[PDB]
Design a protein around this nucleic acid. Structure first.
Ligand SMILES: [Ca+2]
Ligand SMILES: [Ca+2]
Length: 287
DNA sequence: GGGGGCATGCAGATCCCACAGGCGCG
DNA sequence: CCGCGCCTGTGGGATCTGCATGCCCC
């Protein structure tokens, strides 16, 4: 049990969060929800988040996945209050804005009159993946292509939570095809759907390093932010997350990541014994 | 008396994670 | 040569997202 920084929580919500508006039947029932599902290894984050918001239920989905679900109405107010003070950054903010106007419709109790569900389906048709086939056949009169959020990084604490979700620290070992000497390469990467390309591109100027790699438009719908130059990693990337602590197993991956960075800064990665530890400081992180 | 809210399942779709290899450059 | 690191390319599963349903209560 502990509490995390609010900007770190918002950043992690931009990565793994999901806003849900369920409309099922003609007695149409409604269900507003915020959900996060992770691997069992990161059950601490969900309990860390639940202790911060004092809401939600943490269940087990299968033998490997935990889930945190907030479904009560009065308990969705603290979520909306929090996100109003710490706004989301990715295109998920658009789903949150539709999540909020769906809440105010259900708060005025108008969501049960015939006028209410007609707007909520109109609201639902714009968030996440839209409506189903049946309700789209039950409301082929849906009107309303929402305004696209385009923000930059608000701060580094948002990045700590965001990196704890979609980020990645890992070690590269390359056997030189000419020298047969083991090469060690540290790299930091964040992947993301191309719908937030402007946000991912703003990481370059805010961190002072990194590159954006895309691939052709026909074969891929997600890009990568990546830092491979060791000097940028040791002097820019590492101090950022030393100040803004990551959460979950990403903190453990980052700690082992920094152990390799220091073995390299001490030039011990050229030694036979130093190369042995780095190899273990690579199997550590797969487990 | 039953309607709407809550808790609690289960499952599909995909956007991630954690890499690999070729090769130009200083 | 040689190590660095830009640059292209990716398998597979942890994710994001959706549907269902019996129970409870007021
Ligand atoms: Ca994400
Ligand atoms: Ca993750």
């Amino acid at each position: 049990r502990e509490s995390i920084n609010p900007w770190i929580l918002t950043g992690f919500a931009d990565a793994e969060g999901s806003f849900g508006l369920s409309i099922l039947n003609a007695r149409y029932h409604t269900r507003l929800s915020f959900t996060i599902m992770l691997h069992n290894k990161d059950k601490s984050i969900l309990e860390n988040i639940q202790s911060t918001w004092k809401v939600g239920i943490i269940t087990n989905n299968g033998d490997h996945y935990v889930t945190l679900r907030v479904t009560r109405f009065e308990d969705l107010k603290v979520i909306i209050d929090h996100f109003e003070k710490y706004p989301l950054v990715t295109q998920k903010l658009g789903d949150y804005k539709l999540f909020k106007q769906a809440f105010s419709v259900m708060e005025n109790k108008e969501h049960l009159k015939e006028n209410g569900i007609k707007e909520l389906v109109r609201i639902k048709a714009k968030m996440n993946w839209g409506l189903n086939d049946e309700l789209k056949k039950a409301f082929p009169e849906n009107i309303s292509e929402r305004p696209l959020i385009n923000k930059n990084i608000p701060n580094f604490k948002w990045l700590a939570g965001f990196t704890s979700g979609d980020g990645s620290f890992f070690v590269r070992l390359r056997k030189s095809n000419v020298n047969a000497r083991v090469r060690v390469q540290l790299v930091f990467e964040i992947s993301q759907h191309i719908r937030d390309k402007n946000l991912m591109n703003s990481l370059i100027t805010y961190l002072g390093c990194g590159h954006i790699y895309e691939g052709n438009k026909s074969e891929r719908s997600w890009l990568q932010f990546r830092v491979e130059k060791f000097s940028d990693i040791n002097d820019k990337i590492i101090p950022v997350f030393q100040e803004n602590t990551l959460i979950g197993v990403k903190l453990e991956d980052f700690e082992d990541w920094c152990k390799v960075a220091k073995l390299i800064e001490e030039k011990k990665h050229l030694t036979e014994s130093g190369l042995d530890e780095i190899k273990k400081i690579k199997l550590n992180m797969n487990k």
